[model samples]
Target chain A: LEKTLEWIVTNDNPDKIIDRLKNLKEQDLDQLNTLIGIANLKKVLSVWESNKLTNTSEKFWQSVLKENTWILSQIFSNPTVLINDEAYVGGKTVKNDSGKLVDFLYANPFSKDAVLIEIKTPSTPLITPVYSAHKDLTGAVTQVLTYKTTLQREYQNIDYNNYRQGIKTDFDIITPCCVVIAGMFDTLTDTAHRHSFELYRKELKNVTVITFDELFERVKGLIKLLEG
Target chain B: EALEKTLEWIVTNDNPDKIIDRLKNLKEQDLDQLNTLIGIANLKKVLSVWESNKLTNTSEKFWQSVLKENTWILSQIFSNPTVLINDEAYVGGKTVKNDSGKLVDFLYANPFSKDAVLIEIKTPSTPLITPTEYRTGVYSAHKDLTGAVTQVLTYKTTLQREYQNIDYNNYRQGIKTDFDIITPCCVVIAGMFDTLTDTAHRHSFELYRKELKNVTVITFDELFERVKGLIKLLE
Candidate 1:
């Protein structure tokens, strides 16, 4: 699994590798499964890369995330990761209570501590030259804090038990930490840019803000290691 | 043009004491502006040496000596280094007996707030992160990084504990700083990250950094890149 993931993350435009899998027969089910998974990851990264340049709307980014839930694992830099898209904290299927849908609830294979992720567009400005906080970044931070609060309270309700029993047999939610992935820094040269990011990131006790460019660069760095 | 004029002044001025006398006469605000101008000039000079890769020797003592002599270079790494305290700033000597008088590498005052900043420098060759036995696949901070973190934390704690004492209060008054010494933000500049091989290492590094509330961990390469970025921004 690690080997396959390393390959997918390292290679650019990994989606094209999927065509090679067609020649495999039933005897090669394991290889086929792994290759297909790699292809999916490649496709997701490709979409993110494209979206990062286009400066698409928040809704578009959200939809792409909802469809490719595995991308959360990549962004978080965890290989053994799982995500439940639009996870409900309140009653499942009950319209009014279900209105509170967490963008994604994920847990790494190493720990049982569940994490909540809230994403913004790649174009979201991380810092403004003016004294005030960047509204988009702060807004996302505020939104994720609310999500953590809701999850904290709602996790104990009977609705949560009923929902978990039907889906995941051993589902559990811990005091959720939050991650906010948003924005692209045009240049990291300005002292204000570095200072503002450091100051803002330090202040958010619950959330960690990662820019799209940072994420993409890490992915590329990983590829170099894999290739070697 | 202003930089050129400043350069001209620097060339023409022969007496160091005369320049010091002129600087001492300026008001606090004027001196602050002058400090920034000097900092910029010094930064450019530092970057020229830094860019030449002349300081590639990564011995901890070497890096420490460089930073100790050229403390103003920290202005680029840290925010608002207008009031860097010089003497009587060592945190452990008088405060704690038999504590090796471990003089802090660099100390600066926060201009906007009443908080003092502590900085601890490690060699650029120091490892950034290391693996942990508790978590096999994951990595924790390297021992050097953790040691620096603990060292700076101890400095802050000692300062806080001794803030009300006569020794510390006198030192604070001498520096003309009003910071209450409740919590001091620490910065550690250690390690080489431009050669980071894997995504997992970067992820581990980011995770460890995000977990630090009071301290900001930055790489030597990251600092260098920031300076280069600033140069471009200036252009």
Candidate 2:
């Protein structure tokens, strides 16, 4: 029984004997289901790490992330965070105040409050001009800030007509938040740079800037917990 | 039967280390069961940590030391943790300077508004109420608490005054000045609320927080409680 279970975990195609069992008990069935989920999660992370995308297109990452919006929750460390990809705010598929499509509009599963997210490729720099914020980082922040301002200023009008464009009718927002998940920090492998990154995050009040690599780091931690 | 019993115990147990040790010598089939069981056990451990009141203390040094050493944990506590742009050389031709190199303990942007946020951390050892005013049912801010508010206010005023002509283009690259500051918000994370014994004390504290328009105050205990509440919802 032990060898059979071990084989099931190691091999993608396990022994055929378990397939012949017509009366697998409830206890064994439950474990089998959980193991399946774990295997899938592990496989997902393994592929993600191996593919460490450096200079992929933003749309490429957006499509990848939209399929797993749960990764957004993990990135922000907020479990309630949920998202709608390529969201159409302002009643139409019109470009936002910044003249760009909002990549993702994240909301609480239980609340009307929502956050706007913008993505840059993983190859973007973490910081630019040596000691200052990166231009890509600043550009994304300005763009999302424009989106939040537009939505908040016109929430009633947007809400009234958003349903026609496929937005949830109750998609009212107050104090809209913005996040930019950009850059790959593999170059920031030093303590000083890491501390500076921490300090940079510590200061901003509204916008959150996270790196793509950080997201995988957190997922790895979750995977380790399960592997234990 | 023993293997089945062990699997059941793993699910019921909250300790990851103990479960790991117990399953170390198990057969490969048993190891598969252990992997599934560990996932559930680890989640339980996460929930239990938040449920536990682990940081109950009145020592200012202890709380300060903990935060100073583990500043990274602040990201977990606050939403949208980004540092405020404090560029000095580009403010104006005069080259304005902050009162001190460190004006506020920490600065952050509003998670929603993206406005500048000024945060000042005080030791949790500060009193919730003064002994002299304890019997009168009136709550008074401790000297430490008063000092924190005063310092933060000064930082806010100084930044507003100095950066009136701040170069938006060159200013801290990632922050947007177009939205306007509108009296940047200041926050003080100080003291412990457990000392507030009566409803009046709690209400008075609440009233104080409400009265301040551009400033908000929170206690260490309340901060932890809010974090715990979010974790509970997530769980």
Which candidate's TM-score is highest?
Answer: 1
lDDT of each residue in A1-228, candidate 2, tens digit only:
345345434654322322322123333333333333335445557566776754367777766666455335434533233233343211113223453232223222222355577877888887643267678788888888877777666665555676677534333446756788877777877777777777888888799887777777766654443343
Q: Which CAPRI category fits model 2?
A: incorrect
- State the lDDT of candidate 1 residue by residue for B88-194, as single tens digits: 23121111122344333122221223344576777777877765433754677778888888888876777666554533666766855454545656778877786
Per-residue accuracy of model 1 over A100-132 as CA lDDT, tens digit each = 433222221122244577777876766667245
Q: Give each model a TM-score.
A: 0.38, 0.37
Give the DockQ (C-alpha) for candidate 1: 0.01
Question: Each candidate: what lDDT?
Answer: 0.51, 0.51
C-alpha lDDT of candidate 2 relative to the true structure: 0.51
Q: Output the TM-score of candidate 1.
A: 0.38
Q: Where does model 1 exceed 4 Å of error?
A: A1-228, B1-41, B82-113, B131-136, B166-181
Interface RMSD of each: 29.1, 17.2
**Please, what are the lDDT tens digits per residue for candidate 2 over residues B92-165?**
00122344563321122212222344566666666655566655666665576667778888877877654444
Error of 2 at A107 (Å): 12
Positional deviation of residue A197's Cα in model 2 after best superposition, in angstroms? 3.8
